[PDB]
Amino acid sequence: SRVFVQPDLADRLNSRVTVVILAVSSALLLSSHFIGDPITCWTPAQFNAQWVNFVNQYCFVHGTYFVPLSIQYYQWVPYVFALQAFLFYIPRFIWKAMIAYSGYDLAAAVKYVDRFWSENRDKDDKFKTRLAAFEGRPSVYIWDGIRLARKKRSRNMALFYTLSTVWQAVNAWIQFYILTQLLLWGPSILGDLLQGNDWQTTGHFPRIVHCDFNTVLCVLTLNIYYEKLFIFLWFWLVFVAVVSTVNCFKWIYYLCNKTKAQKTIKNYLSTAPIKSTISDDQFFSALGEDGLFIMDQMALNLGDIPASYLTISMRNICQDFI
Amino acid sequence: SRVFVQPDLADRLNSRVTVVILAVSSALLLSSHFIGDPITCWTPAQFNAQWVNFVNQYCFVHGTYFVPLSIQYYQWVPYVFALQAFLFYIPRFIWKAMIAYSGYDLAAAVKYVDRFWSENRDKDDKFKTRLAAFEGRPSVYIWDGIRLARKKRSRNMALFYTLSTVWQAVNAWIQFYILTQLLLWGPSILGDLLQGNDWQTTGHFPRIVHCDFNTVLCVLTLNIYYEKLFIFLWFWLVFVAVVSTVNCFKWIYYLCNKTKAQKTIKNYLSTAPIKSTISDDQFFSALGEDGLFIMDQMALNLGDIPASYLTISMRNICQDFI
Amino acid sequence: SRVFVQPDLADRLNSRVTVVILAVSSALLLSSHFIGDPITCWTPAQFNAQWVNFVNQYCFVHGTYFVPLSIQYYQWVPYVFALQAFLFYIPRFIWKAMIAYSGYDLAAAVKYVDRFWSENRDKDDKFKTRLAAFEGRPSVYIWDGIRLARKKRSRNMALFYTLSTVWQAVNAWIQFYILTQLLLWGPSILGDLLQGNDWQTTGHFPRIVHCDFNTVLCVLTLNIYYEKLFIFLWFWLVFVAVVSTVNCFKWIYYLCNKTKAQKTIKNYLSTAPIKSTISDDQFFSALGEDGLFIMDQMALNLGDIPASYLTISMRNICQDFI
Amino acid sequence: SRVFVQPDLADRLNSRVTVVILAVSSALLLSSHFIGDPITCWTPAQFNAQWVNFVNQYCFVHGTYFVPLSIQYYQWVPYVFALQAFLFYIPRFIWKAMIAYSGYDLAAAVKYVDRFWSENRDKDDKFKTRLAAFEGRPSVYIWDGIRLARKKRSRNMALFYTLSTVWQAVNAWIQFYILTQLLLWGPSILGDLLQGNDWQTTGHFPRIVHCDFNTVLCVLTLNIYYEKLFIFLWFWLVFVAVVSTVNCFKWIYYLCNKTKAQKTIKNYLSTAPIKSTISDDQFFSALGEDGLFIMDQMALNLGDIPASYLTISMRNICQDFI
Amino acid sequence: SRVFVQPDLADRLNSRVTVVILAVSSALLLSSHFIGDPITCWTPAQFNAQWVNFVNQYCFVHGTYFVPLSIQYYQWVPYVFALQAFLFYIPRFIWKAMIAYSGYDLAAAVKYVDRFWSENRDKDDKFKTRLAAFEGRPSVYIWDGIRLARKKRSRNMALFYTLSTVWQAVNAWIQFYILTQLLLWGPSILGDLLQGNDWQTTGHFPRIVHCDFNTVLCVLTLNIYYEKLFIFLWFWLVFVAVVSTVNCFKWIYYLCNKTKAQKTIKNYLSTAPIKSTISDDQFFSALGEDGLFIMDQMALNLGDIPASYLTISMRNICQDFI
Amino acid sequence: SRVFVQPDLADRLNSRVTVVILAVSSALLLSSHFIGDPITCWTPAQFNAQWVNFVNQYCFVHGTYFVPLSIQYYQWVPYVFALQAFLFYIPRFIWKAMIAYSGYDLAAAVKYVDRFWSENRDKDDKFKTRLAAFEGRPSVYIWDGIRLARKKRSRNMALFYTLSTVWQAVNAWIQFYILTQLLLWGPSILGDLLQGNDWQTTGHFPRIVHCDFNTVLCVLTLNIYYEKLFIFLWFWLVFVAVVSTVNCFKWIYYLCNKTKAQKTIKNYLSTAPIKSTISDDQFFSALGEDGLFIMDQMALNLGDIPASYLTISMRNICQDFI
């Protein structure tokens, strides 16, 4: 599994890059406020190089307030980020478990046809009898997979995929809303920032805060990297959520129509110069349950030509049912 | 053994990832409070850079109390975690020892059929005579294993597997309960935390504690990583325990039924276009004791197609008993 | 994808080198003002090695003014640079997504013909029957790609490419304008610098600034690397924008003419000593929709000879339409 | 030797893991109290950063006493541990020397048959004539080894193995007893620890001890890792001793019975469809002296099938004596 | 491109070594005055280890004057050097772009004939029919390149090469003049240095300078590496400029003569014992436009023998025009 | 030589492991008292961080005395150990030189027959004609070596080997005695240590010594590693000496008997089913001078089976003398 099952949908690797970017940010913030110094302080009488080395930690863990010329989110962001990264990685595992429970095995079939194509795409002798090759080796494997899956909890694989996509969209929107509930709705802070009010007057996100100690004037270095990060993370999260919602609506419309869903297969079926006996309708009657989604996956993953060859070879041996 | 016997059940690698995560946490805590400084102190008169370098260790090993505006678990968590990791790794060793005492050898058989399939899955000449290949090389190996094991303490392998799973579930629940007995039942601390009472008022998990010394006001840095860790470890342990209990009940129901246990084999047996002589009942009468579990393992490990081929070839040579 | 789809247009790798240079500059500035010291200060009474270690950060985050014998852009440049680098990388992703939505697959076809040529360019036996080889193996692949793409949202691929180039040009000009709106129009600062007014009199870009603190005279080391960088970045950005605009106008003129667009193909078609049956016009009538752009890509990527061979072999089997 | 003779009995690698764990503990303790600081002290008047750098070593080498609100074992444990590790490694060398003096060579024979099996386990042509292969190449090697050893101090190899196992058990129990004589019998300290008496009242294992110096109050950091180590080492040593004693009694019962010792061979001999001429008794009369133990070793090391094949081929050529 | 197009003219790698040496010098100077200390100062009253750590940077960025017993070029040399290195690398890119726009592809042809020669230079069977081999495989490739280039903006390739060389010479002289305008014309400073006036009396290039500060006597360490570098850089730049000008005049004379330009080809044509039909004049009439320069490149790059073989084989198939 | 002649007698690699352990100890002691601090001192008035940094070296090189509540061996042990390691490595070189002067070459012959066996031990076709193979290739090499050596100072090789072993035993005993003459005969110090007198009362091996300086109380850290090392080195040296003496007496008895020395050869000669013509006595009369020792070496190095095959093949061609 770790070799091949663990390791390309159009704009689904956005979950992978999301996990990557959020984990990088979280781990870098941990490294910053655990290796370097996140805060500094200044008691305007005198130090001993060990006063400040304690007042730093004190004023860090204790609360700090700010006043222009005890509010802090230091204790949640670099951990809610790791939690968010884990929640972004969840949906891929959900989809894998769903395809495992469905009964069929799609990853292995894609890898098999991919290896077949990458192997005999260059053999000159095995290129004129190309359709013969495709109906010979891999087509039987795909058909046996279809046959075995048809009798075990696999008649609505597309429904499981659409549910996975719905969960992905809901998860992205929930992550964005969670980011919103950790302080100001974006363009508000940008307007207060673009018109020239950085923090002196607008108040929020301070960088020179006082400290209670029984006039300590502590400066929050690492804070300057938080409102250089949220301004980008907000935009990028809303973009990811929008693209995921668009993909979700696309797959919903695909599932609920089933009429223009066979557009690609009906297109592929009109290329080979054979058109021998099997009508268009009975091919679907034998395959339309699940094999439609699998052929669409082969097309969306391998490409178009090696998928057209496969789906036009599969007609020539389609006799298990009709 | 270290090459092949030492190195994929659905949601059993949760024990492996459990050992990994707990060992990482424990070793990182040891490294923190053994390389970096875990504590800091402040006597509000004067230091000499060697006062604090002793009061740190003193107030660490000695007890510390806390009062709002000698309780500590520093000395057990980073070691009970390693003990828990070892106890999570135990059940895999128990299962290996049980399969060794059973008499049969399952890992080697799985590896053999896996190598056979991975080797001759691509040979074009050895793909039409596919059933012949499977009934030729590996089927005889599986049958000889069955025959040798049938006469040595191997008639109830499924019972040993179910006992291993029961032990896994009991172990997970005991680990969770052990985590509970080291201080507040989860959602209680979360509610006291989500409504905005971090530690100032709620008391437990302090970060600014006093110290007896014959007003030392020591700060516990590393404590901030403990209630950022338990909040996650509780959820994750209860999830692992729940999934293990579900798997346990599944295997119990499998063992006690034996009627719908042959569903997969009865399904596979209805695919090949041979159906020559051997009735369905006598195949089971020759195999149903142990080979059922072994075929289920081959299916749950190799996949479905290379398991169907194997179990439909094994009928064609099933003559040792009937 | 990460192996082959993710990885040579004439002066488009200027976007790649742009991303490289801007990311290097931004990351080096972050490393400088996060590892080394970016600023220094001097209160002309006395220090304690911890005064300055706080006044540095204070005067850094707080504003600083300058007077000859609170203005600073320290907080935006090293981040607007990373944003600019991301915006320079966007257009390549836009073009990839556009070619994916178009229906055809150009990268795989280029790689296939490239592998074919690099493989059998040296075989002596397969060099007299060279035209036979080209019309044999890869030409059929190209034609099948054409045929499959012709029936799926691919009749105006050149329009999508021209739109990608327009977006590239607009993006480059917007990046330059953004650089301009972060303070002086180039040659002005150069004239004030070439005639011998570095910063003492001209004022802007100071290096010895005062600081408010309730006469601190802080020196900005890292500032000396900013007006050694803008002077070059301005020139290089305007050069990149000019070359991109020239490329854009070239492709616009190409798309809108369509008469001298077939100049290269009409030239290639007059070399082989065959000229057997297919007139020049019907070849284009079968190919002129999309295959023109694909042949131009093969020529602009592979070279000229292996493209001429391909496009003169494709005539000998051009019969799918006429 | 270092290549192959120097490098899998069931629960004998417990000696290897024992050596590993004890050597790790000992070397880590040496590194701790030789690189880091093991002790700290505090004279409550004043230091000079070189007082403590001498009082540390003084109070370390000199004795230290403890009193609640000159006893130390610092000088023996991290060396008795290395001595124990060496004494755990001894029995393997004893067994190797015993098998060398016995006359036969078992390791080379096991490696030879292992290489033979791993080589020709996959050859399809050399799989129908499988019994022929086994009686052909390796069986003659095993028989020649038997013949050469029969005339040189090798008639009671099992006795030497049983003596090695007796020595292993005695050594494990002696190591445990040695651990006991270095201060409290386990569960006593656990009860005094589980009921909540860490060291303040129970006294033993102090961490805040005084020091004679002509009120020094030295703290023993590294001591906190000793009673976090003995509590585990006691349990693990008693477990290793118990398992070794069980193995010893098993092999004693094996040697003294000789009746159910041939159970495995009598089982293997009833599988091949030959049963040609050689009775069961005369096979043992030719082999029962030493070859019984060697076949048991082949079974306990290679597995069961490649051992059954070997022992059923060895009958077909058993003619050197009868 | 990065593999083969990006990677041997006689004394053109002087541009490569120029870029190397100037980039090394510039980067080493940056590393020196950014990692080590470039300056030191001494206020003859008292310091605090932080006075000097600020006066260093102050006196560095601010001006410094010198008086024997505010002039500085610290701020331009280590950057004008990088600019010069980039300007030395430009001409190679200009030549590559010119050969790309010309229409022909010279690098690929050179690499092809080089691979052909390096491959079949050792085959003994393919060494008697050597001329047959050369007129067989690579000659047709060269001729097809000639034919394709003849109809696309390629009739004056030598003119483009001569323009590239003129640009190289002008660039070298401009770089030298730029070095001169950054302060003394070479031998002047050498004479003032060889006769024994280092800097005490001659003044320029000081190493003990004063500093304004409201008698600071700062020493410029890194200055000692500047007049140990210019003295060599001047000589080496004038040498590079002279050799480039000589090469330029050589190529100008080559282009403008065209009579003794065919000396090498007329020499090669008088070696093979064939002299069959094609007169000397018509060969040139078919090739003299561009192929002359390409054959000269093959000779100047591959060597002489593998170029003579090629150019004497090309006559035997020269029939495309005459 | 460095490849093969420079690189397995039973318990002769004890010299190799002896050199290893002594060199490790010596080099580690040098590293300790040359990198870390070996000593510490305390003048009970005041320091300046440079007093102690000189008194350390002074009191180290000068003598130190001890008194309970100028004796030192610091200057010899870590060098006498390296001398001892060299003297332990000597005997192997002596044996190599002796075998070189003897005339024969044993190492090359052993390596040759080893390579022959390791090569053709697995060939199935070359396994029935096994005796033919052995009498074919390597036997002639061994016989030619015998013949060439018989006429050059090689008739008493066993005498040279026995002398080498006598020298080894004498060297081991001399090394042990040298260890004894560097201060208490072992069990004396152990008894004074086991009954509980570490150094306070027993005196020898002090760790808190005074120092003359014109009451310095210096502590000898590294001393604690000397009486943790001698206690083990004494036991291990006496064990090595005993085993070497036993081996020496064994080889003496072997040389002086010559009757039961041919026991192994007389045993091997009674296995092959040939016994054709050559009597037992004449084989020895042709070989008994030197070849006896060489066959014993082949047996003690290669194993028993490949030595039996060789010595039974050598009879079938033994005709050079009789």
UniProtKB/Swiss-Prot annotation, chains A, B, C, D, E, F:
Membrane topology per record: Multi-pass membrane protein
UniProt-listed InterPro entries: Innexin
Pfam families: Innexin
GO biological process: monoatomic ion transmembrane transport
Keyword terms, alphabetized: Cell junction, Cell membrane, Gap junction, Ion channel, Ion transport, Membrane, Transmembrane, Transmembrane helix, Transport
Membrane-spanning ranges: 19-39, 80-100, 159-179, 229-249
Single GO term (MF): gap junction channel activity
Record localization: Cell membrane; Cell junction, Gap junction
A GO CC term assigned to this protein in UniProt: gap junction
Family: Belongs to the pannexin family.
Protein name: Innexin-6
Gene it is expressed from: inx-6
